[PDB]
Every structure is written in C-alpha cells, then in structure tokens.
Amino acid sequence: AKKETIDKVSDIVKEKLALGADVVVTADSEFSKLGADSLDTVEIVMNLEEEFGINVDEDKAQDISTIQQAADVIEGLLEKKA
C-alpha cells in the first residue's frame, strides 16, 4: 500500500487515545496493542470509512491483517466500491 494511506490508517488508531507525539508509528504493527485490549473494530472501521469517505463492509473489516493489509484494502475501496 502507499505510505500516504498507511500513515492515515495508523493515524486513526492513534487518534483513539491521542498518540503520534512521542510514539513511533509502523505499518507492520498489528492494530492490536497492549492496554485493555478492547474491541474497536466498529469505531475503527467507521473512522477509516469516514475519513477516506469510502464504503467498507463489516465482512471486509472482520479479519483484516495488520495495518499494511488495511491500507491495501482501502486503496481498492478508494478506487472501487464495495
């Protein structure tokens, strides 16, 4: 996926708890992270769809690999549809 899209996807996660200040951001860094480990797929998916302005189905945002994959999937939605 493109760096621009990857940075955006990773940015969404940080916005969850206000990050990106003194924390390093990576694409290979799975969405999951230590801390509560609560589910935020519904919130996360909407953030990406809301930000990008695409139409991602829940069936597509149910078993998405790390950010790398997320960015790649979005790239298609940005060009395709659903």
Catalytic residues: 37
| Tokens found for residue 49 | 């769809």
Nearest to 46 by CA among 33, 61, 32: 61
Contact 29, 67 (CB under 8 A): yes
Pairwise CA distance, residues 23 & 54, whole Å: 28
